[PDB]
């Protein structure tokens, strides 16, 4: 639980850096995914580079019991509840011929319990293929070909990839007959006719304010068996930008939303959305003080290998989210219409893991 909070906290901080760059664009990010991959990379690092990652994340992986709790978290987050709703993968690609440190491979498998993938980067097209094939075979072909793999060179020695796909089954599905086309107000004032689903139900609903003093509402949408849930947060007034909500995001605030919630009868009109986002993690991580990782000589990967000057040639995250009627009367006094840009959060409630989060500017 404590590691799950630390991991999500770091991941929401990386998302904010991704969201502030896009601003007017659709973004889908995995806070757990970026934490899981950088927790693995902590083992490859030493010196100045390791302390940069450890300080920004808020935890050391070699500390006890950080890794056993991290494993127990994946086992927990994974199976048997997820009916091929969620498909995740983490991969560290290293040079095949590169002489690894004596006792790194047994120490990495002892803690995860997986291995660092070995590929020959001199065979450029085959190297790009194996990276894309690993993503395709582990995410059930739901994620489209990587665009970042174009940075794969002969001089490339270390590649980081994290891919996630999610299309969850709702606890209470939205009726198909209730799905109608309605106007969506874009940030630039313009309106678009988008398909919007609707359902009258008892929703976990709360109201919070921004520092500047503005109201924003948070609605909780549960997935089957109450394991996973989706939070939809957006400011009440359309004149208020979604950035005002994004700038104040943290893992503690998301927990406060859940704690302050009350079950209320409402008619919910929410749009259908399908987003795919490939993120180059270089700039969001460099902005968070993790600059050494991508520097030619400054990068300290001495814990993995000391045979050649090592550094991250590519660090990516490709996430795909699908929100429809179902993964595969009722009385209400007021209706909630999500006809303006909104923020979404996919949370694993027993541990408080922020698996997914993003901004839907235009469905």
């Amino acid at each position: 639980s404590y590691v799950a909070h630390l991991a999500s906290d770091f991941g929401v901080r990386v998302f904010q850096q991704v969201a502030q760059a896009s601003k007017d664009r659709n973004v889908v990010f995995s806070p757990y995914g970026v934490a899981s991959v950088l927790a693995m990379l902590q083992l490859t690092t030493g010196g100045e580079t390791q302390q940069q990652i450890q300080a920004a994340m808020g935890f050391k992986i070699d500390d006890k019991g950080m890794a056993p709790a991290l494993r127990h978290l994946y086992k927990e987050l994974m199976g048997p509840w997820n009916k091929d709703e969620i498909s995740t993968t983490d991969a560290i690609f290293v040079q095949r011929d590169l002489k690894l440190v004596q006792g790194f491979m047994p120490h990495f498998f002892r803690l995860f319990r997986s291995t660092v993938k070995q590929v020959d980067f001199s065979e450029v097209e085959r190297a790009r293929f194996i990276i894309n094939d690993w993503v395709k075979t582990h995410t059930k072909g739901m994620i489209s070909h990587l665009l970042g793999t174009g940075a794969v060179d002969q001089l490339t020695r270390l590649v980081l990839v994290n891919a996630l796909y999610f299309n969850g089954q709702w606890k209470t599905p939205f009726p198909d007959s209730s799905t109608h086309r309605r106007l969506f107000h874009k940030s630039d004032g313009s309106t678009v006719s988008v398909p919007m689903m609707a359902q009258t139900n008892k929703f976990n609903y709360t109201e919070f304010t921004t520092p500047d003093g503005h109201y924003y509402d948070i609605l909780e949408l549960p997935y089957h068996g109450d394991t996973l849930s989706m939070f939809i947060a957006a400011p009440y007034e359309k004149e208020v930008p979604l950035s005002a909500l994004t700038n104040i995001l943290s893992a503690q605030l998301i927990s406060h939303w859940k704690g302050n919630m009350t079950r209320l009868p409402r008619l919910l009109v929410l749009p259908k959305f399908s987003l795919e986002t490939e993120v180059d993690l270089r700039k969001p991580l460099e902005n968070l003080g993790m600059t050494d990782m991508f520097r030619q000589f400054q990068a300290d990967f001495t814990s993995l290998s000391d045979q050649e000057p090592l550094h991250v040639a590519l660090a990516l995250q490709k996430v795909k989210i699908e929100v429809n009627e179902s993964g595969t009367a009722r009385m209400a006094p007021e209706e909630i219409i999500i006809d303006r840009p909104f923020l979404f959060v996919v949370r694993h409630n027993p541990t408080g893991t922020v698996l997914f989060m993003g901004q839907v500017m235009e469905p």
Partner: antibody
Amino acid sequence: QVQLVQSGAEVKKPGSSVKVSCKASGGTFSSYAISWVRQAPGQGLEWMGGIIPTFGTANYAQKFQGRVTITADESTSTAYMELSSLRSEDTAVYYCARERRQWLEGHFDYWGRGTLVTVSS
Amino acid sequence: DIQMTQSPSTLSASVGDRVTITCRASEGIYHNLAWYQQKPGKAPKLLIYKASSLASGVPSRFSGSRSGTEFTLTISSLQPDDFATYYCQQYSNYPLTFGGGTKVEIKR
């Protein structure tokens, strides 16, 4: 041009069952909610329940549970409200209210003239 | 159950005066508050919905605002037709509850 015509005033002994009607014209009856709000002499307003004619089943206040029965005849375009086990405390003006918004039961724009129900004894 | 408290119970004012009448909820009701006007021997008439939105055909002098869990109905310039009883109603959760009422009288 929405109008809500209610049945005539009634005086009943503290037995007893009183049934008040509410004819609606002109608009879609099936989709919009018709509620019942009462007002005691020299007192405030009190919501009893409401009904969306297409739903069939009415919403009620836990205070009046086991007494009230709210029905709506789609063909007649009239909503009803019967109150059993009447007493001196039920002496009030009964208003018929209609929602401006579809499928919802919150605030009312259209109101009927009122039916006075005197409970005596 | 959300208790609707109205302050004052009785209000005395002159024609052309600014009138402010208060409503209070026992718990948060979002912006889901309606304002009604009632004249003796007449059915209630909706003026304000969603705390500040003005109902169809209702004049400009009528205003609404939200201050946390408190809502105020403002009449900028009081007119002879405005001397009536005013009720606030919440539409957040069931049961739908109304306020105690605030009668607006002629200042003599």
